[PDB]
Every structure is written in structure tokens, then in C-alpha cells.
Amino acid sequence: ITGTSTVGVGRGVLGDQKNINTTYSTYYYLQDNTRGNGIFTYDAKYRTTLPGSLWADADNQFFASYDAPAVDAHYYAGVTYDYYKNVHNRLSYDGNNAAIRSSVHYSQGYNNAFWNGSQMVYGDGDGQTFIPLSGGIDVVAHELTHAVTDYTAGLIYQNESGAINEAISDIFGTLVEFYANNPDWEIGEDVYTPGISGDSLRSMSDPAKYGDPDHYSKRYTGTQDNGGVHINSGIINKAAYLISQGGTHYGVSVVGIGRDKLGKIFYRALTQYLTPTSNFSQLRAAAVQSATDLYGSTSQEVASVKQAFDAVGVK
Ligand SMILES: [Ca+2]
Ligand SMILES: [Ca+2]
Ligand SMILES: [Ca+2]
Ligand SMILES: [Ca+2]
Ligand SMILES: [Zn+2]
């Protein structure tokens, strides 16, 4: 890992060619020295022991099918870093350039990805429900954003706190996807269900399309999914979508203010006002205050934040 900074070339999960920052010392390692204290990508070798081995490659070319998840995990970690640096002046997830570690080829047929408190982990999928989940930029940014949340607001992964946590990751996952520029308000569409076109794991524009609630009245109150952290996120995701894009939802009209202002407001909320036990009502209050800080109390931006949360029934 002490070596010389170099640039490798390879193919991502969706077959797209890609330059990646590597480190040469005998082998070429997926180690990016150009971003903070590093981006390191590991091979978990189909096992669940973490992080696994720092990805070594003989010739700095990554075109093998086995390489594809690593290439994207490494690359999109870079893009997500750039986003938080360039757009929010945040240096890595901890704000002090902590090294960003990812492992790919986690387990077998593993249809998920997660941030384990220390690093990102990507399964390869079963090839039917998922292909390698690092292939989705919104997925990578989603998981990396969990790190940002844990180091800032510290939202408990349970009930409404957890649903906000999830929504924050969907929100910034989407905003990274727009930042990289085939952008949309869907989640996981690039790596979800090959064979079936046009679907996704979640929708921010229309959460009900996949059975998730788009209104606080329709919120889940059972025990599954840690109190519906991936389900009730739809309520916050819709609110976010309405802030950005505008629209009329259950008879409540919302004037959009764009994704850039959506991002500034929610980032400020996340890092200045939100706490580990914040509920949806407190999120509203934090978003309204953040918008007030940035744009002023009589501004359109504050009005639209109010309109959006009114629309999804969060008072
Ligand atoms: Ca090679
Ligand atoms: Ca997309
Ligand atoms: Ca997407
Ligand atoms: Ca699909
Ligand atoms: Zn998540």
C-alpha cells in the first residue's frame, strides 16, 4: 500500500469502460491516493470475513468479469467522495478525510449491500434479483451516506429515526447519481432485476409504485424491517422529491426549488439539527429551520419545504 500512484483502466458491472486510481508496488492495488486518506477496495472472495484482501492486480487492467464489481465499488466511492467534497465541502464521511473502505464479492448470491459501521460491503446478487450491487451509483452513494449520517446526526436505525436515516441515504444517493449525470428518482434501477426493464427497488417520485407509503397516514407501524425503515422512508423520499421537482400530492401543491437547494437544505438539517432520536415532525422542523438559515423565513424555499411536508401529512 506504500507504492506509486497510477491510473488503471477497466470495465464496470454494466460493461462500461472506466479509469480508476490505483497504487503500484509489485502489484497494482485498488488504492486511490488522490482522495483524502485513501479509497481502498477489497476482495471478500465469496466469504463473509471482512474486509478481505486489498484488491491486487498484475497489469493494471480490470476487464475480467470478476473485476467488474471492484472497479465500480472503487470508482463510485470516488464519485461520492467528490460530491461531498465539491458540493458540501465535507471531507469524506467523517469530515476529516477518513479512508473509505469497500469489500466486493461478499458471500454468495448475496442480494444486498451495506455499511457495517466501518466500511462498505457489496454482494454480487444472485443474477436474477440483483447483479453486483456496486454497479449502481445510487446504491454506492446510499451506503456511503449511512457513514455520513452515523458520524453526524447519528439517526438510530429504528422506527421513524431509522426511516429518516434511510431517506437521507436515498436522497443523497439520488443526488450523487444526478451529480455523476441516466439520472432519475428511482433507487437501484441499474442493478435490480436484469430481465425486467423499467423497475427499481424504491421510487422517490412515486413510492406507492412498489407499495411504499407516500403519506404519513399510510405509514407502517409493525415490527418488520426495524419498524419499517425502508418502508416509511417513502414518506420522506416523496417529500424530498416534491421539494426538488414540485407537484401536487393529495391536493397539496408544491413549488419545486431544484435538486441543488434540496441538497443544501437536507445536508444542513443532517449536520446541524438532526439528532439520533429525531422523528418525522422534528425532521420537518429541522428542514424548515435549515431553509430559513440559507434562504430566509419569507423565502420560496421555506414555503416549499412546508408545502412538501404538508403534502405527505407530516406536521
Ligand atoms: Ca488485470
Ligand atoms: Ca439512473
Ligand atoms: Ca437511481
Ligand atoms: Ca430491473
Ligand atoms: Zn440504507
Catalytic site residue from 105, 230, 249, 301:
230
Nearest to 169 by CA among 136, 194, 191: 136
How many whole angstroms from 57 Cα to the centroid of ligand 3? 30
Is residue 215 annotated as a catalytic residue, yes or no? no
Helices H / strands E in the chain, number of each: 8, 15
Nearest to 136 by CA among 101, 63, 211, 186: 186
User: Which residues, including other chains, have CB under 8 Å from residue 115's CB and lie 6 or more apart?
Assistant: 121, 143, 144, 146, 147, 150
Measured CA to CA, the distance from residue 30 to residue 41 in angstroms comes to 5
Determined by which method? X-ray
User: Which residues, including other chains, have CB under 8 Å from residue 207's CB and lie 6 or more apart?
Assistant: 213, 214, 234, 235, 237, 238
- Cell numbers describing residue 8: 488503471
Q: What is the largest CA-CA distance in the chain?
A: 64
- Cell numbers describing residue 168: 437521507
Nearest to 147 by CA among 77, 250, 218: 77
Is residue 230 annotated as a catalytic residue, yes or no? yes
295 among annotated binding-site residues: no
Nearest to 234 by CA among 277, 197, 201: 201
How many whole angstroms from 184 Cα to the centroid of ligand 4? 14
Q: Each residue of 166-176: b (16+ CB within 10 Å) or e? A: bbbbbbbbbbb
For the chain, which residues make up each domain, given as ranges? 6-154, 155-314
301 among annotated binding-site residues: no
Phi, psi of 275 (to 5 degrees): -130, 170
The pairing of strands 61-62 and 113-115 is unpaired
Hey, how many other C-beta atoms are within 10 angstroms of the C-beta on 87?
A: 16
Residue 19, CB-side half-sphere exposure with 13 Å CA sphere: 2
How many Å separate Cα 96 from the centre of its chain? 19
How many whole angstroms from 78 Cα to the centroid of ligand 5? 19
- Cell numbers describing residue 181: 449525470
Beta-sheet strands, E only, within the chain:
4-11, 17-25, 27-29, 31-32, 39-43, 53-54, 56-57, 61-62, 100-104, 113-115, 120-122, 186-187, 202-203, 247-249, 252-254
How many whole angstroms from 131 Cα to the centroid of ligand 4? 10
CATH 1.10.10.10 given to domain 6-154: no
CATH code matching the domain that covers 155-314, chosen among 1.10.10.10, 3.90.550.10, 1.10.390.10, 3.40.50.620:
1.10.390.10
